[PDB]
A paper describes a structure:
Here, we solved the three-dimensional structure of a major fragment of FlgK from C. jejuni, strain ATCC 700819/NCTC 11168, using X-ray crystallography. To crystallize FlgK (67 kDa) of C. jejuni strain ATCC 700819/NCTC 11168, we removed 68 and 28 amino acid residues from the N- and C- termini, respectively. The remaining 58 kD fragment, named FlgKcj58, has 511 amino acids (See Methods for detailed experimental procedures). The crystal belongs to the orthorhombic space group P21212 and it diffracted to 2.45 Å resolution. The structure of FlgKcj58, in which 11 C-terminal residues were not resolved, comprises the fragment [Asp69-Gly568]. FlgKcj58 can be described as composed of two domains. There is a central domain, D1, which could be divided into two sub domains, D1a and D1b, and a more compact domain D2, consisting mostly of β-strands. The structure of FlgKcj58 reveals that the cell-proximal half of the protein, which includes the N- and C- termini, and which is known to connect to the hook, is structurally conserved when compared with other known FlgK protein structures. However, the cell-distal half of the protein has diverged, developing a different 3D structure. Domain D2 of FlgKcj58 has a different fold compared to domains D2 of FlgKse49 and of FlgKbp64.
Numbering used by the authors: 70 to 569
Write the structure that this text describes.
């Protein structure tokens, strides 16, 4: 009857893990329905149709306003969808603190019970058994929360010993990951702490000499094990997110969705000539950092700075090359060089430079900034050949941002939709660039995942892969949960049968 009770605790630990897991994964799936034309997919469709209406009538300023309107709706939808996952992750983080608080109350109440059971005084038989009943009750409740090891040696009432004294630590020990929460009559709590203002709770066992044993990566089982696996266990203060975790993995795919959407759209829109182009603020971009190391989506290759006059004729092309050592200073050295051995038209005409290109790092802000201002009578564009240099840095881009939470339309476009162009040459007439953005919705593009894989899909296919992954996780867990219930009921019936 004591052995089946040992099985009941283990059955509870497994069932409460998958039960908490099922509740959280079901909520996430309700937020991310694996259905076409809902949520972001519906906003993405209205966004692409808005590009189609604009490419049909690029001179009508009303279609520019409608396009910017549908783009802001899309980015905001991407912001809110990420905020939904962020809120659930913070909810799990708060549950971790509550569960740890409950674990400590249980352990303290068990250690206090043990002070009577193993105390010097003799207790009435009935009071001793109801204290023992309560301790078994608390032990069983504890198994719903965490995997804990209770090692017990039971007292023999043959007497033949008194007056002696009791060694309570040898009679009862309750441990978590090997560390004694209850050592006989002594209570040792789990400790919570955090370092940044996300209050990413870490779980510690502290020794009497204030030495620290972090358990965040080791604690498993029950509600706490599921909370840790959902939220993430290794927090990173530099990056302000978790290095693992089921929910964290959904957030990273959502960021990778936005990052690719920003990169691939901006790569195309950067090829539309403009009077000047300005990057976003590039946080931490010193002039000596290799570009492929600053942004993992930057690939070796080349892009061409392209110069047009105000009537829309291509006057110039300067090819800038990126390899795995190319820094921003290196980009400037190539831009600010001369040579240019070319043979355009006509009569050896191409002369000097028609742009003022600039990079600057603000040591007080920690941000870098890249600008190319074409001189009056000229426009500048960037046509990339694999690097995503302009797209990742939003040089002449349509979208700003780096992830799902800061994705937005570029401010100069939001503030004046009439600045939107559809043509490569910058004249407010053609539509060869906007047609490329329309076709981009069908194109297999790269998604650089945090796990190290590179998905090659369309935007919609990648997002549906995320909602399918969430549904597949919730279903796989439902199978493990289902067998956990049957095992729990079977063990619970055996426990009831083998008792009173």
């Amino acid at each position: 009857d004591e052995y089946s009770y040992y099985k009941l605790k283990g059955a509870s630990t497994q069932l409460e893990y998958t039960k908490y897991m099922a509740s959280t994964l079901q909520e996430i799936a309700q937020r991310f329905p694996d259905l076409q034309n809902t949520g972001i997919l519906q906003d993405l469709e209205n966004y692409n149709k808005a590009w189609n209406d604009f490419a049909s009538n690029p001179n009508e300023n009303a279609t520019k306003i409608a396009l910017v309107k549908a783009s802001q709706t899309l980015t905001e939808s991407v912001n809110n969808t990420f905020a939904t996952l962020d809120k659930i992750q913070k909810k799990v983080n708060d549950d971790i603190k509550n569960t740890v608080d409950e674990i400590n109350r249980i352990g303290e109440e068990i250690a206090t019970i043990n002070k009577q059971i193993y105390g010097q005084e003799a207790l009435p038989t009935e009071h001793a058994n109801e204290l023992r009943d309560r301790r078994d009750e608390l032990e069983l409740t504890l198994s719903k929360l965490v995997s804990a090891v209770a090692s017990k040696n039971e007292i023999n009432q043959d007497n033949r010993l008194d007056t002696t004294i009791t060694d309570p630590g040898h009679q009862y020990n309750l441990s978590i990951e090997g560390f004694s929460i209850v050592d006989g009559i002594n209570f040792h709590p789990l400790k919570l702490d955090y370092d940044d203002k996300n209050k990413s709770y870490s779980i510690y066992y502290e020794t009497p000499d204030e030495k620290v044993r972090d358990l965040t990566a080791k604690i498993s089982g029950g509600q706490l094990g599921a909370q840790l696996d959902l939220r993430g266990r290794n927090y990173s203060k530099s990056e302000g997110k978790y290095e693992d975790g089921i929910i964290q993995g959904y957030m990273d795919s959502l960021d990778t969705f936005a990052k690719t959407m920003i990169n691939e759209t901006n790569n195309l829109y950067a090829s539309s000539a403009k009077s000047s182009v300005t990057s976003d603020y590039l946080s931490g971009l010193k002039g000596d950092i290799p570009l492929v190391n600053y942004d993992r989506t930057i690939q070796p290759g080349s892009f061409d700075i392209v110069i047009y006059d105000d009537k829309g004729d291509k006057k110039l092309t300067k090819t800038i090359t990126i390899d795995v050592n190319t820094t921003m200073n290196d980009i400037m050295r190539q831009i600010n060089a001369n040579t240019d051995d070319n043979d355009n038209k006509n009569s050896n005409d191409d002369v000097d430079d028609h742009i003022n290109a600039s990079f600057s790092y603000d040591a007080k802000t920690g941000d870098g900034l890249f600008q190319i201002n074409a001189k009056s009578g000229f426009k500048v564009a960037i046509e990339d050949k694999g690097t995503n240099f302009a797209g990742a840095f939003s040089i002449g881009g349509f979208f700003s941002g780096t992830d799902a939470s800061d994705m937005k339309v570029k401010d100069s476009i939001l503030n004046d939709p009439s600045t939107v162009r559809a043509s490569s040459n910058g004249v407010d007439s053609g539509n060869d660039m906007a047609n490329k953005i329309i076709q981009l919705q069908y194109k297999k593009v790269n998604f650089y995942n945090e796990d190290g894989t590179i998905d090659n899909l369309t935007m919609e296919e990648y997002y549906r892969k995320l909602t399918g992954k969430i549904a597949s996780d919730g279903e796989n867990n439902n199978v493990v949960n289902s067998s956990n219930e049957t095992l729990y009921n079977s063990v619970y019936s055996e426990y009831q049968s083998k008792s009173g």
